[PDB]
Amino acid sequence: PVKLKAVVYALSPFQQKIMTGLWKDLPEKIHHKVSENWISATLLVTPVVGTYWYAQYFKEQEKLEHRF
């Protein structure tokens, strides 16, 4: 058991609004999500999208060259 010194104040769940906080400070929420995760999103989408479009391009060149 860890020895902990702290003071905690809590409010009853029936004395606060439960759902309005979902849409509070939304521009901050969208800004934080993008600004911290854009590199992560790029590292995940770019190789799957780059490989896919290359394969489509290759199949188009391979099909056309086999024609007459």
Added chain:
Amino acid sequence: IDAVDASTVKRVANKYIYDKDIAISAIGPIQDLPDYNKFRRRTYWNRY
């Protein structure tokens, strides 16, 4: 005082105790004290 019979106690208790909000003030080694939701739930019995 004599007017407070068993039916009176149950009526008053249902007005002030049953499924009511509570206030808690604790100090010391109180990590094992149940949280607010546990005390809140123990204000009613679901078997009745």
